[PDB]
Write an enzyme that holds these catalytic residues in place. Structure first.
Site, PDB file in Angstrom:
ATOM      1  N   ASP A   1       0.844  -1.245   0.154  1.00  0.00           N
ATOM      2  CA  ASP A   1      -0.041   0.104   0.087  1.00  0.00           C
ATOM      3  C   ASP A   1       0.787   1.170   0.100  1.00  0.00           C
TER       4      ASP A   1
ATOM      5  N   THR B   1      -7.027   2.974  -2.023  1.00  0.00           N
ATOM      6  CA  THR B   1      -6.711   1.532  -2.020  1.00  0.00           C
ATOM      7  C   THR B   1      -7.707   0.700  -2.249  1.00  0.00           C
TER       8      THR B   1
ATOM      9  N   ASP C   1      -0.602  -0.384  -5.150  1.00  0.00           N
ATOM     10  CA  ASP C   1      -1.857  -0.023  -5.408  1.00  0.00           C
ATOM     11  C   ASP C   1      -1.799   1.572  -5.733  1.00  0.00           C
TER      12      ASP C   1
ATOM     13  N   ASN D   1     -24.338   8.567 -23.197  1.00  0.00           N
ATOM     14  CA  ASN D   1     -24.705   7.975 -21.893  1.00  0.00           C
ATOM     15  C   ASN D   1     -23.280   7.547 -21.090  1.00  0.00           C
TER      16      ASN D   1
ATOM     17  N   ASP E   1     -20.657   6.220 -21.102  1.00  0.00           N
ATOM     18  CA  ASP E   1     -20.052   4.712 -20.799  1.00  0.00           C
ATOM     19  C   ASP E   1     -18.871   4.240 -21.603  1.00  0.00           C
TER      20      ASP E   1
ATOM     21  N   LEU F   1     -18.242   3.945 -24.372  1.00  0.00           N
ATOM     22  CA  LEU F   1     -18.808   2.986 -25.580  1.00  0.00           C
ATOM     23  C   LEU F   1     -19.576   3.858 -26.811  1.00  0.00           C
TER      24      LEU F   1
ATOM     25  N   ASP G   1     -22.061   5.181 -29.089  1.00  0.00           N
ATOM     26  CA  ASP G   1     -23.471   5.392 -29.094  1.00  0.00           C
ATOM     27  C   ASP G   1     -24.091   4.628 -30.358  1.00  0.00           C
TER      28      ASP G   1
HETATM   29  C1  LIG Z   1     -14.805  -2.695 -19.147  1.00  0.00           C
HETATM   30  O1  LIG Z   1     -15.238  -4.129 -19.104  1.00  0.00           O
HETATM   31  C2  LIG Z   1     -16.442  -4.252 -18.990  1.00  0.00           C
HETATM   32  C3  LIG Z   1     -16.534  -5.958 -18.833  1.00  0.00           C
HETATM   33  O2  LIG Z   1     -16.619  -6.351 -20.011  1.00  0.00           O
HETATM   34  C4  LIG Z   1     -17.456  -3.886 -19.729  1.00  0.00           C
HETATM   35  O3  LIG Z   1     -18.676  -3.795 -19.284  1.00  0.00           O
HETATM   36  C5  LIG Z   1     -19.636  -4.640 -19.621  1.00  0.00           C
HETATM   37  O4  LIG Z   1     -20.441  -3.878 -20.689  1.00  0.00           O
HETATM   38  C6  LIG Z   1     -21.614  -4.184 -21.433  1.00  0.00           C
HETATM   39  C7  LIG Z   1     -22.230  -3.181 -21.989  1.00  0.00           C
HETATM   40  O5  LIG Z   1     -22.349  -2.060 -21.267  1.00  0.00           O
HETATM   41  C8  LIG Z   1     -22.504  -5.186 -20.185  1.00  0.00           C
HETATM   42  O6  LIG Z   1     -23.424  -5.861 -20.919  1.00  0.00           O
HETATM   43  C9  LIG Z   1     -24.657  -5.817 -20.459  1.00  0.00           C
HETATM   44  O7  LIG Z   1     -24.874  -6.890 -19.420  1.00  0.00           O
HETATM   45  C10 LIG Z   1     -26.101  -6.947 -18.965  1.00  0.00           C
HETATM   46  C11 LIG Z   1     -26.099  -8.060 -17.866  1.00  0.00           C
HETATM   47  O8  LIG Z   1     -25.454  -7.608 -16.841  1.00  0.00           O
HETATM   48  C12 LIG Z   1     -25.358  -8.352 -15.567  1.00  0.00           C
HETATM   49  O9  LIG Z   1     -24.496  -9.541 -15.894  1.00  0.00           O
HETATM   50  C13 LIG Z   1     -23.261  -9.480 -16.096  1.00  0.00           C
HETATM   51  C14 LIG Z   1     -22.277 -10.882 -16.239  1.00  0.00           C
HETATM   52  O10 LIG Z   1     -22.153 -11.626 -14.955  1.00  0.00           O
HETATM   53  C15 LIG Z   1     -22.558  -8.726 -14.759  1.00  0.00           C
HETATM   54  O11 LIG Z   1     -21.097  -8.682 -14.920  1.00  0.00           O
HETATM   55  C16 LIG Z   1     -23.323  -7.379 -14.785  1.00  0.00           C
HETATM   56  O12 LIG Z   1     -22.456  -6.784 -13.625  1.00  0.00           O
HETATM   57  C17 LIG Z   1     -22.960  -5.229 -13.503  1.00  0.00           C
HETATM   58  O13 LIG Z   1     -24.027  -4.879 -12.679  1.00  0.00           O
HETATM   59  C18 LIG Z   1     -23.949  -5.506 -11.399  1.00  0.00           C
HETATM   60  C19 LIG Z   1     -25.069  -5.088 -10.472  1.00  0.00           C
HETATM   61  O14 LIG Z   1     -26.186  -4.246 -10.872  1.00  0.00           O
HETATM   62  C20 LIG Z   1     -22.718  -4.743 -10.494  1.00  0.00           C
HETATM   63  O15 LIG Z   1     -22.309  -5.482  -9.422  1.00  0.00           O
HETATM   64  C21 LIG Z   1     -21.372  -4.896 -11.548  1.00  0.00           C
HETATM   65  O16 LIG Z   1     -20.468  -3.849 -10.902  1.00  0.00           O
HETATM   66  C22 LIG Z   1     -21.832  -4.476 -12.848  1.00  0.00           C
HETATM   67  O17 LIG Z   1     -22.022  -3.097 -13.092  1.00  0.00           O
HETATM   68  C23 LIG Z   1     -21.424  -2.255 -14.043  1.00  0.00           C
HETATM   69  O18 LIG Z   1     -22.069  -2.586 -15.452  1.00  0.00           O
HETATM   70  C24 LIG Z   1     -23.509  -2.210 -15.590  1.00  0.00           C
HETATM   71  C25 LIG Z   1     -24.270  -2.555 -16.878  1.00  0.00           C
HETATM   72  O19 LIG Z   1     -24.487  -4.120 -16.842  1.00  0.00           O
HETATM   73  C26 LIG Z   1     -23.413  -0.507 -15.318  1.00  0.00           C
HETATM   74  O20 LIG Z   1     -25.105  -0.328 -15.213  1.00  0.00           O
HETATM   75  C27 LIG Z   1     -23.025  -0.102 -13.868  1.00  0.00           C
HETATM   76  O21 LIG Z   1     -22.869   1.163 -13.652  1.00  0.00           O
HETATM   77  C28 LIG Z   1     -21.446  -0.669 -13.850  1.00  0.00           C
HETATM   78  O22 LIG Z   1     -20.786   0.170 -14.807  1.00  0.00           O
HETATM   79  C29 LIG Z   1     -24.557  -7.466 -14.517  1.00  0.00           C
HETATM   80  O23 LIG Z   1     -25.018  -8.088 -13.086  1.00  0.00           O
HETATM   81  C30 LIG Z   1     -27.306  -7.014 -19.900  1.00  0.00           C
HETATM   82  O24 LIG Z   1     -28.427  -7.173 -19.506  1.00  0.00           O
HETATM   83  C31 LIG Z   1     -27.170  -6.150 -21.078  1.00  0.00           C
HETATM   84  O25 LIG Z   1     -28.284  -6.035 -21.940  1.00  0.00           O
HETATM   85  C32 LIG Z   1     -29.034  -4.969 -22.383  1.00  0.00           C
HETATM   86  O26 LIG Z   1     -28.921  -4.104 -23.494  1.00  0.00           O
HETATM   87  C33 LIG Z   1     -28.981  -5.018 -24.784  1.00  0.00           C
HETATM   88  C34 LIG Z   1     -28.535  -4.235 -26.147  1.00  0.00           C
HETATM   89  O27 LIG Z   1     -28.284  -4.897 -27.055  1.00  0.00           O
HETATM   90  C35 LIG Z   1     -30.298  -5.625 -25.018  1.00  0.00           C
HETATM   91  O28 LIG Z   1     -30.488  -6.611 -25.877  1.00  0.00           O
HETATM   92  C36 LIG Z   1     -30.885  -6.159 -23.544  1.00  0.00           C
HETATM   93  O29 LIG Z   1     -31.890  -6.449 -23.939  1.00  0.00           O
HETATM   94  C37 LIG Z   1     -30.466  -5.461 -22.438  1.00  0.00           C
HETATM   95  O30 LIG Z   1     -31.374  -4.110 -22.478  1.00  0.00           O
HETATM   96  C38 LIG Z   1     -32.634  -4.013 -21.689  1.00  0.00           C
HETATM   97  O31 LIG Z   1     -32.273  -3.574 -20.336  1.00  0.00           O
HETATM   98  C39 LIG Z   1     -32.116  -2.029 -20.485  1.00  0.00           C
HETATM   99  C40 LIG Z   1     -31.425  -1.561 -19.165  1.00  0.00           C
HETATM  100  O32 LIG Z   1     -32.376  -1.508 -18.270  1.00  0.00           O
HETATM  101  C41 LIG Z   1     -33.327  -1.533 -20.894  1.00  0.00           C
HETATM  102  O33 LIG Z   1     -33.070  -0.102 -21.056  1.00  0.00           O
HETATM  103  C42 LIG Z   1     -33.854  -1.911 -22.455  1.00  0.00           C
HETATM  104  O34 LIG Z   1     -34.974  -1.308 -22.746  1.00  0.00           O
HETATM  105  C43 LIG Z   1     -33.922  -3.475 -22.383  1.00  0.00           C
HETATM  106  O35 LIG Z   1     -34.904  -3.938 -21.528  1.00  0.00           O
HETATM  107  C44 LIG Z   1     -25.791  -5.829 -21.374  1.00  0.00           C
HETATM  108  O36 LIG Z   1     -25.252  -6.974 -22.292  1.00  0.00           O
HETATM  109  C45 LIG Z   1     -21.805  -5.713 -19.112  1.00  0.00           C
HETATM  110  O37 LIG Z   1     -22.621  -5.977 -18.103  1.00  0.00           O
HETATM  111  C46 LIG Z   1     -20.709  -4.946 -18.548  1.00  0.00           C
HETATM  112  N1  LIG Z   1     -19.818  -6.025 -17.393  1.00  0.00           N
HETATM  113  C47 LIG Z   1     -19.247  -5.295 -16.186  1.00  0.00           C
HETATM  114  C48 LIG Z   1     -18.866  -6.147 -15.441  1.00  0.00           C
HETATM  115  O38 LIG Z   1     -19.430  -4.112 -16.016  1.00  0.00           O
HETATM  116  C49 LIG Z   1     -17.129  -2.110 -19.959  1.00  0.00           C
HETATM  117  O39 LIG Z   1     -18.026  -1.811 -20.896  1.00  0.00           O
HETATM  118  C50 LIG Z   1     -15.546  -1.979 -20.267  1.00  0.00           C
HETATM  119  N2  LIG Z   1     -15.413  -0.614 -20.387  1.00  0.00           N
HETATM  120  C51 LIG Z   1     -15.011   0.169 -21.457  1.00  0.00           C
HETATM  121  C52 LIG Z   1     -15.044   1.443 -21.497  1.00  0.00           C
HETATM  122  O40 LIG Z   1     -14.464  -0.488 -22.425  1.00  0.00           O
HETATM  123 CA   LIG Z   2     -22.175   5.539 -25.214  1.00  0.00          CA
HETATM  124 ZN   LIG Z   3      -3.535   5.578   2.269  1.00  0.00          ZN
END
Ligand SMILES: *[C@@H]1O[C@H](CO)[C@@H](O[C@@H]2O[C@H](CO)[C@@H](O[C@@H]3O[C@H](CO[C@H]4O[C@H](CO)[C@@H](O)[C@H](O[C@H]5O[C@H](CO)[C@@H](O)[C@H](O)[C@@H]5O[C@H]5O[C@H](CO)[C@@H](O)[C@H](O)[C@@H]5O)[C@@H]4O)[C@@H](O)[C@H](O[C@H]4O[C@H](CO)[C@@H](O)[C@H](O)[C@@H]4O[C@H]4O[C@H](CO)[C@@H](O)[C@H](O)[C@@H]4O)[C@@H]3O)[C@H](O)[C@H]2NC(C)=O)[C@H](O)[C@H]1NC(C)=O
Ligand SMILES: [Ca+2]
Ligand SMILES: [Zn+2]
Ligand SMILES: Cn1c(=O)n(Cc2ccc(F)c(F)c2)c2cnc(Nc3ccc(C(=O)N4CCC(S(N)(=O)=O)CC4)cc3)nc21
Ligand SMILES: [Cl-]
Ligand SMILES: [K+]
Ligand code: NA
Length: 805
Positions: free
Chosen positions: A121, A159, A308, A685, A687, A689, A691
Site C-alpha cells: 500500500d 486502496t 496500489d 450515456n 459509458d 462506448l 453510441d
Molecule cells: C470494461 O469491461 C467491462 C466488462 O467487459 C465492460 O462492461 C460490460 O459492458 C456491457 C455493456 O455496457 C455489459 O453488458 C450488459 O450486461 C447486462 C447483464 O449484466 C449483468 O450480468 C453481468 C454478467 O455476469 C454482470 O457482470 C453485470 O454486472 C454489473 O451490474 C452489477 C449489479 O447491477 C454490478 O455489481 C457490477 O459492478 C456491474 O455493473 C457495471 O455494469 C452495469 C451494466 O451491466 C452498469 O449499469 C454499472 O454502472 C456498472 O458500470 C450484471 O450483473 C445485459 O442485461 C445488457 O443487455 C441490455 O442491452 C442490450 C442491447 O443490445 C439488450 O439486448 C438487452 O435487452 C438489455 O437491454 C434491456 O435492459 C435495458 C437496461 O435496463 C433497458 O433499457 C432495455 O429497454 C432492455 O430491456 C448488456 O449486455 C456488461 O454487464 C458489463 N460488465 C461489467 C462487469 O461491467 C465495460 O464496457 C468495459 N469498459 C470500457 C470503457 O470498454
Molecule cells: Ca455510449
Molecule cells: Zn493511504
C-alpha cells in the site's frame, strides 16, 4: 450471532470459510468478530519470535513456538524462514547471484508454477530508486526479473478501487468500488472503510482472480488478511499452504501490506521516518524468498511485487473550503479530501440545483486548487462516470491539496503529511511493478503500463481464461518468456462503398455557397487520379481503420486526405492525413471564408446542409481535414467539401482552429512529420462506448445531423525520429486526445487569453489511449503495419502523460 465455543484445533487458516453461526478459523475471522475462542492460542502463536538462533537448531519440537527449528520442521512445513541459513549453513536468497530461470524447477507433484502476488500500500514508484540502499531483496527481484519504471493506478488513486482493479482487470466504474467511501441510491446503503456494510458482496462486481481460478479448477489461497495478523504470520501461513498435498494446495496466493502507506500519511512520502518501513517491507520479502528457497520453490514460483498507488505531500493547511464558495453549504453532502463528490443532502429539497453549484465553484479564486466537473465532462481517460455510485458533481483536486466542506471538518473530525487519491496521471501517484520467476523475462525493463492490464497476465500465468475485462489481452506479452496470449485482429464487420461521381451540382439544395467557379488536360488527369486514391499511401499509413459494427459508409479519397464517411451520421467516422516536417501552413483565402461545397460522390440525402447551421444560433461548423494545411491552392477546395464538415460550437472552434492551424504543424516539426486521424465521438450515456443513433441527445436544429460529445485525434510518427513519419521502418510513437465538445470554455480559467496560453493545456488534460478511442468509435486502427500484433496492442494502450521525468 457466532457460536465461538467451537475450536480451531487442526483448522488454523483453513481455506474454506464456514457459515454462521459456526465459528471460524480463516484469515478473515478477526474482521468479522467470529473466530473460535481458541484462535489466538492455536493460530496466532508468537512464542520465541520469528527467527531461528544457533541454540534452537535441532531443538525438540515445542508446539507453542511461533515457528520451528527442530529437525522435523521441513517435513512439517513450519520452520522459521531463516532455518536453513542459521542451522544448515545455507545463504539467504538475497545473497545468491542472480541466475536466469529458463524453465520452472519445481518439486514433483507441482502441476504449474504457483503465482504469489505481494502487494504493498502506498508504495510510490520512486521508492525503487530512492530507497534502493535499504531494500536489497526488492532490488534483487527488480534487477533480476522484469520491471517497469512505474505502473499507472486507476482513479481515484485510493486502496479499495486499486486493489480491486488489480484483482478484476476492471475500471472502478465497472467493478463498483468507486471510492473508499460510497453511497448507492438504489440500495440506499453506504460503504465505509470502517464497519460491516463493506463485507456485503453486492458492492463487489466483476469476477476477481480468486473466483476466476476456482471456477476453472485452480485452487486459491484467501487474498484478504485481517489487519491485526502480523506480516510474519501471513508469510508463514503462505509457506504452510505451499506444503499441503498436491490435491489440497493452492496455485495462487496473495499477501498485502498496509505499509509503507500508513507511515507515509504520518510523515509524507520522503519523511526521514520512511526509511524504517521500507527496510521492514524488504525484510518481509526476504522472509518469503528464504522460505521459498527452503521449500525448493525459489526457481518455480512466479512472484509479482505490485503497489496500489503512490503518496504525495499534503498538509492540513492546504485545504480549500466549499463554505468559501457556496452560499448554501448545508444543503450539500461532500465526499472530501483528495477528490470531491457532491450531492444533495436531502432528496426532498426541490431548491437544490447542480447548475448553480457548479457555477459557484468555477474559476472563482485566482489560484483555485480544485476544478468542478459534471462527471460526463471529466477526461475520458479517467473512465470515471458510468456508475450510480459516482455523484454527478465531481471536484478534481490539485496535487498537494485537499477539499473540505467547512473549516471545522479539518479540526473536529495538523496531523498528516501525506495523502493520495488525485488524478492517476500525477507523478506522485504512480506505483510499482516487478515480476520475477520462470514465466517472466530475465533482467528486462518494460515501459510503464496500467494496472488494469495485470489481471489478464495473472490469468496467463495460471492457464486461466480471463473474465471479460478492460485490459487489452496481449498488450503485456512482452513481459513474459512463455504463456503469451496470441490474439487475432478483430474481423471487419462493415465493408466500405467506394463511390464515384454520381450527382450533378444542381441536385443539391443545401443552402451552401462557394466562390469556386474558376477556369487543362495536364492537370485534369491528376485530379481524377487523386479522387481514385493515388495519394492514399501517403495519407493512410497504417491501413484503413476497420469498422467493427454494422453501418453504411463510403471511402472518399482526396489529394491531401482520406476519409470514411458515414451515411447514417452524415459526417466522417475518421479522416486521415499526413503532414511532413516540410509542410507549409496557409490561410483560408478571404473569398473562401464561408465556402461549403457539395460532394458529387455523395447523395444530397446523405449530406449535411448549410441552412441547418444558419438557423441553429448556438451551433457552427468546422472541418476535419484542416484547410490551413492544404498542399496547394487548388487542393484546398477539397477541404471545404460538405463531407469534411462537422458540427462545432463557436467556443470549441477556438480550440479546434488553434490545434489545426498551429499545433499540427508544431508536432510535424518536432516529430519529423505526423500522421493524423481525427473524427467525432458520440457518448451521450457516458459509458465509454460508441453510441447507437437512438442514444443521441442533440442534433443541429431542424436536421438529423447529430452533435458529437467529443472530437478525437490520433497523432502517429516514427519512434526513431530520424526517419519521417511516412518512411518509418521500425516501431511507432503515438499521442492522442479526446476533447470534450463543449459550448463554453468554462473548464479553462484562462480562456479569455490568446489560445497560446490555454489550448495545449486543455488538450494535455484530455490525453487518451488509442484503445479509448477504439471503444468510443467501434473502429480498429493500425490494421496494416510492419509490426507484430502484440507490439501494436502495446501501442494502442500507450498514454502520453505530459508529466516531467
Ligand atoms: C470494461 O469491461 C467491462 C466488462 O467487459 C465492460 O462492461 C460490460 O459492458 C456491457 C455493456 O455496457 C455489459 O453488458 C450488459 O450486461 C447486462 C447483464 O449484466 C449483468 O450480468 C453481468 C454478467 O455476469 C454482470 O457482470 C453485470 O454486472 C454489473 O451490474 C452489477 C449489479 O447491477 C454490478 O455489481 C457490477 O459492478 C456491474 O455493473 C457495471 O455494469 C452495469 C451494466 O451491466 C452498469 O449499469 C454499472 O454502472 C456498472 O458500470 C450484471 O450483473 C445485459 O442485461 C445488457 O443487455 C441490455 O442491452 C442490450 C442491447 O443490445 C439488450 O439486448 C438487452 O435487452 C438489455 O437491454 C434491456 O435492459 C435495458 C437496461 O435496463 C433497458 O433499457 C432495455 O429497454 C432492455 O430491456 C448488456 O449486455 C456488461 O454487464 C458489463 N460488465 C461489467 C462487469 O461491467 C465495460 O464496457 C468495459 N469498459 C470500457 C470503457 O470498454
Ligand atoms: Ca455510449
Ligand atoms: Zn493511504
Ligand atoms: C480491497 N482488497 C482487495 O481487492 N483485496 C484482494 C487483493 C487484490 C489485489 C492484490 F494484489 C492483492 F494482493 C489482494 C484485498 C486484500 N487486503 C485488503 N486489505 C485492506 C485494505 C484496506 C484497508 C484500509 O482500511 N485502508 C488501507 C490501509 C490504510 S493505512 N495504510 O492508513 O492503514 C487505511 C485504509 C485495510 C485492509 N483489501 C483488499
Ligand atoms: Cl472515496
Ligand atoms: K449557427
Ligand atoms: Na474560461
Amino acid at each position: 450471532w457466532t457460536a465461538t465455543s467451537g475450536s480451531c484445533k487442526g483448522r488454523c487458516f483453513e481455506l474454506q470459510e464456514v457459515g454462521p453461526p459456526d465459528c471460524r478459523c480463516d484469515n478473515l475471522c478477526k474482521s468479522y468478530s467470529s473466530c473460535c475462542h481458541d484462535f489466538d492460542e492455536l493460530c496466532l502463536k508468537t512464542a520465541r519470535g520469528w527467527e531461528c538462533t544457533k541454540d534452537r537448531c535441532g531443538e525438540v519440537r515445542n508446539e507453542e513456538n511461533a515457528c520451528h527449528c527442530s529437525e522435523d520442521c521441513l517435513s512439517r512445513g513450519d520452520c522459521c524462514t531463516n532455518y536453513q541459513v542459521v542451522c544448515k549453513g545455507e545463504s539467504h536468497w538475497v545473497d545468491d547471484d542472480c541466475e536466469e530461470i529458463k524453465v520452472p524447477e519445481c518439486p514433483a507433484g507441482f502441476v504449474r508454477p504457483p503465482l504469489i502476488i505481494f502487494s504493498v500500500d502506498g508504495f510510490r514508484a520512486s521508492y525503487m530508486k530512492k530507497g534502493s540502499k535499504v531494500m536489497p531483496n526488492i532490488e534483487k527481484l527488480r534487477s533480476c526479473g522484469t520491471h517497469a519504471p512505474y505502473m499507472r493506478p486507476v482513479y481515484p488513486t485510493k486502496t479499495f478501487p486499486n486493489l480491486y482493479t488489480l484483482a478484476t482487470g476492471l475500471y472502478p466504474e465497472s467493478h463498483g468500488i468507486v471510492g473508499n467511501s460510497m453511497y448507492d441510491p438504489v440500495f440506499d446503503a453506504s460503504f465505509h472503510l470502517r464497519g460491516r456494510e463493506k463485507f456485503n458482496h453486492r458492492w463487489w462486481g466483476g469476477q476477481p482472480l480468486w473466483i476466476t481460478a476456482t471456477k476453472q479448477g485452480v485452487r486459491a489461497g484467501t487474498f484478504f488478511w485481517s489487519v491485526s495478523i502480523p506480516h510474519e504470520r501471513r508469510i508463514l501461513t503462505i509457506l504452510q499452504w505451499l506444503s499441503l498435498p498436491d490435491n489440497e494446495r493452492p496455485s495462487v496466493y496473495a499477501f498485502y501490506s498496509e505499509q509503507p502507506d500508513f507511515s507515509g500519511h504520518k510523515y509524507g512520502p520522503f519523511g526521514p521516518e520512511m526509511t524504517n518501513p521500507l527496510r521492514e517491507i524488504d525484510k518481509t520479502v526476504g522472509q518469503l524468498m528464504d522460505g521459498l528457497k527452503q521449500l525448493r520453490l525459489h526457481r518455480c514460483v512466479n512472484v509479482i511485487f505490485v503497489g496500489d498507488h503512490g503518496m504525495e505531500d499534503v498538509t492540513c493547511d492546504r485545504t480549500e473550503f466549499l463554505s468559501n464558495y457556496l452560499t448554501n453549504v448545508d444543503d450539500i453532502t461532500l465526499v472530501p479530501g483528495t477528490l470531491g463528490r457532491i450531492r444533495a443532502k436531502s432528496i426532498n429539497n426541490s431548491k437544490y440545483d447542480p447548475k448553480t453549484i457548479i457555477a459557484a465553484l468555477t474559476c472563482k479564486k485566482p489560484d483555485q486548487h480544485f476544478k468542478p466537473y459534471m462527471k460526463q465532462h471529466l477526461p475520458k481517460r479517467l473512465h470515471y462516470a458510468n456508475n450510480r455510485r459516482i455523484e454527478d458533481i465531481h471536484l478534481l483536486v490539485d496535487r498537494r491539496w485537499h477539499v473540505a466542506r467547512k473549516p471545522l471538518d479539518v479540526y473536529k473530525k495538523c496531523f498528516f503529511q501525506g495523502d493520495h487519491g488525485f488524478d492517476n496521471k500525477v507523478n506522485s501517484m504512480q506505483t510499482v511493478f516487478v515480476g520475477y520467476g520462470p514465466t517472466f523475462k530475465y533482467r528486462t525493463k518494460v515501459p510503464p503500463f496500467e494496472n488494469i492490464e495485470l489481471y489478464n497476465v495473472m490469468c496467463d500465468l495460471l492457464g486461466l481464461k480471463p473474465a471479460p475485462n478492460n485490459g487489452t489481452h496481449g498488450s503485456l506479452n512482452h513481459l513474459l518468456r512463455t504463456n503469451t496470449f496470441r490474439p487475432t485482429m478483430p474481423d471487419e464487420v462493415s465493408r466500405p462503398n467506394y463511390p464515384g461521381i454520381m450527382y450533378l451540382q444542381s441536385e443539391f439544395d443545401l443552402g451552401c455557397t462557394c466562390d469556386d467557379k474558376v477556369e487543362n488536360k495536364l492537370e485534369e488527369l491528376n485530379k481524377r487520379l487523386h479522387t481514385k486514391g493515388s495519394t492514399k499511401e501517403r495519407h493512410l499509413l497504417y491501413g484503413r481503420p476497420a469498422v467493427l459494427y454494422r453501418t453504411s459508409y463510403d471511402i472518399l479519397y482526396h489529394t491531401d486526405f482520406e476519409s470514411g464517411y458515414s451515411e447514417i451520421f452524415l459526417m466522417p467516422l475518421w479522416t486521415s492525413y499526413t503532414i511532413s516536417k516540410q509542410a507549409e501552413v496557409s490561410s483560408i483565402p478571404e473569398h473562401l471564408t464561408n465556402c461549403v461545397r457539395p460532394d458529387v460522390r455523395v447523395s444530397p440525402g446523405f449530406s449535411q446542409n448549410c441552412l441547418a447551421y444558419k438557423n441553429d444560433k448556438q451551433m457552427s461548423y468546422g472541418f476535419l481535414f484542416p484547410p490551413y494545411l492544404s498542399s496547394s491552392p487548388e487542393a484546398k477546395y477539397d477541404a471545404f467539401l460538405v463531407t469534411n464538415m462537422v458540427p462545432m460550437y463557436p467556443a470549441f472552434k477556438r480550440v479546434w482552429a488553434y490545434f489545426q492551424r498551429v499545433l499540427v504543424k508544431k508536432y510535424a516539426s518536432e516529430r519529423n512529420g505526423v500522421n493524423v486521424i481525427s473524427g467525432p465521438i458520440f457518448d451521450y450515456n457516458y459509458d465509454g462506448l460508441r453510441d447507437t443513433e437512438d442514444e443521441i441527445k442533440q442534433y443541429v436544429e431542424g436536421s438529423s445531423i447529430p452533435v458529437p460529445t467529443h472530437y478525437y485525434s490520433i497523432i502517429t510518427s516514427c519512434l526513431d525520429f530520424t526517419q519521417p513519419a511516412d518512411k518509418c521502418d521500425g516501431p511507432l510513437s503515438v499521442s492522442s486526445f479526446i476533447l470534450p465538445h463543449r459550448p463554453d470554455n468554462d473548464e479553462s480559467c484562462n480562456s479569455s487569453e490568446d489560445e497560446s496560453k490555454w489550448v495545449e493545456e486543455l488538450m494535455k488534460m484530455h490525453t487518451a489511449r488509442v484503445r479509448d478511442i477504439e471503444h468510443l468509435t467501434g473502429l480498429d486502427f493500425y490494421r496494416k503495419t510492419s509490426r507484430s500484433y502484440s507490439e501494436i496492442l502495446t501501442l494502442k494502450t500507450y498514454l502520453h502523460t505530459y508529466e516531467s521525468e
